[PDB]
Amino acid sequence: MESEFRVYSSANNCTFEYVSQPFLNFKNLREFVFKNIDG
Amino acid sequence: ASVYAWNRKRISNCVADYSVLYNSASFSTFKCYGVSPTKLNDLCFTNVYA
Lengths: 39, 50
Ligand SMILES: *[C@@H]1O[C@H](CO)[C@@H](O)[C@H](O)[C@H]1NC(C)=O
Fold this sequence. Notes:
Shape of chain A: flat
Organism (chain A): Severe acute respiratory syndrome coronavirus 2
Helix content of chain A: under 10%
Distance between the termini of chain A: 37 Å
Protein name (chain A): Spike protein S1
Oligomer: part of a larger assembly
Bound molecules: 2-acetamido-2-deoxy-beta-D-glucopyranose
C-alpha cells in the first residue's frame, strides 16, 4: 500500500497542471527521451 | 467574492469558447479592452486570468 509521499514541502505559484493516463529478474524495460526545445 | 478579496482563477490547457459568452443575453457589460470579441474565438493565449 502506497502511503508515504515525501517529495515536496510547498507549492506556491502554478502555471501548468496535467493529469494523464499511466505511462507504465528484470521483466520490463522502459525507455524515455526528454527534450526541451523552444519551450 | 468581495472586491477586496477578489477571486482569481487561472485557466489553462483547455478550449475556450468565447462565442457562448458573447451571444448570451444575460450580460449587461461585455467591454473588451485591447482585443475584439470576434477574433477571441480564433486567437490562442498562454493563460487566462478570471
Ligand atoms: C509567487 O508566490 C509568492 C509567494 O507564494 C508571491 O508573493 C508572488 O506574488 C507570486 N508571484 C506570482 C507571479 O504569482
